[PDB]
Amino acid sequence: TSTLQEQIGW
Amino acid sequence: IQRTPKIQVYSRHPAENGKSNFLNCYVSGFHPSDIEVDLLKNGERIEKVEHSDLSFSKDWSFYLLYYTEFTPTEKDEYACRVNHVTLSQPKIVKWDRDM
């Protein structure tokens, strides 16, 4: 994907 | 923390009376994102108006462009009405072909 795939919680 | 929007009202091309053009209101450098912008012809709100998708610059300040199709004339007055949290009363900026 062009966007960042990874999901990170604060 | 709140930063007041900066307003510019202008046409897409140099104004020629009786010839179709686009009226632009550019708002920038404002936070938070909630803002109310209207384009006025003879002091009344223009029915159909479009705006770009909301984005921000590197200093995190939001910017938006509101545009409509219009045909300038000597008789009619065009203005941009902006309301924001930073503003106590909405600020009206009238269109000048010169700027």
Binding site: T3 | Y26, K58, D98
Partner: protein, 278 residues
């Protein structure tokens, strides 16, 4: 020559008005190509440039599924932010995320970006090395330690160094016509009298891409930054930009003033003056 791709995320919490709004916008240089809004009836990544339309429905689906997950992440990132700052549910707050890649004429990556902001203030940013974090406050330091522990930097460096450069290189060639061709500004000077002894000289640049441009006023060749009114570069709505610079001149000194325009479209920096004969 040098090019960049960046993505801008805005997650705004609105109490009592439902789910926080998530807006994602994608930019290649000064051109926007993609967009997403959760408030849409059928949120989907949408195209905002003609060249991006060539992509497959699979690509669009991938963008769309990524945005849905990201909205859910930042909705909970918004509530984590409430805890860090001890803020009430009643207030409205914003999380802004900016990430992107800088490439040179070759297209090899020059710089990697990832800055996170909370309520219009710096929160946490990926450092230039792409391995470490910079935290604005103690609340971000809590988030910093989690990202160090979860090795978040390793994934961003991988995305910035690879997937981002490979998609940015692809967008630049698919829109080689629009993205890599430079429109020069069309320039002219206008005279507006303020009075009988004073007048305003306005230098105009219109329909130029990219947005970067330099407008300067010189009187006898001496610079006048102090006395020049310079407006923000603004879009014309046709993916080109406009800018102008103005100086207030005493009557009879107009010929001393000169305007200089610098742009990537121009072969040589132009020098202009007021031409009232025409």
């Amino acid at each position: 020559g040098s090019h960049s791709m960046r993505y801008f995320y805005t997650a705004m919490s609105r109490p009592g008005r439902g789910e926080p709004r998530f807006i994602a916008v994608g930019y290649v240089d000064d051109t926007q190509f993609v967009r997403f809004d959760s408030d849409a009836a059928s949120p989907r990544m949408a195209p905002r440039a003609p060249w991006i339309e060539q992509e497959g429905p699979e690509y669009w689906d991938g963008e769309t599924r990524n945005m849905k997950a990201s909205a859910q992440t930042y909705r909970e990132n918004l509530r984590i932010a409430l805890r860090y700052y001890n803020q009430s549910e009643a207030g409205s707050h914003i999380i802004q995320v900016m990430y992107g890649c800088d490439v040179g004429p070759d297209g090899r990556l020059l710089r990697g970006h990832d800055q996170s902001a909370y309520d219009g203030k710096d929160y946490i940013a990926l450092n230039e090395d792409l391995s470490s974090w910079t935290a604005a406050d103690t609340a971000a330091q809590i988030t910093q330690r989690k990202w160090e522990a979860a090795r978040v930097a390793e994934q961003l460096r991988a995305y910035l160094e690879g997937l981002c450069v490979e998609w940015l290189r692809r967008y630049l060639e698919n829109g080689k016509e629009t993205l890599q061709r430079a429109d020069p500004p069309k320039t002219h000077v206008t005279h507006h009298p303020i009075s009988d002894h004073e007048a305003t000289l306005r230098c105009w640049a219109l329909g130029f891409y990219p947005a970067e441009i330099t407008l300067t006023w010189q009187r006898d060749g001496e610079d006048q930054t102090q006395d020049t009114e310079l407006v923000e570069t603004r879009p014309a709505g046709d993916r080109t930009f406009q800018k102008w610079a103005a100086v207030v001149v005493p009557s009879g000194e107009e010929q001393r003033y000169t305007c200089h325009v610098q742009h990537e479209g121009l072969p040589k920096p132009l020098t202009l003056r007021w031409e009232p004969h025409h």
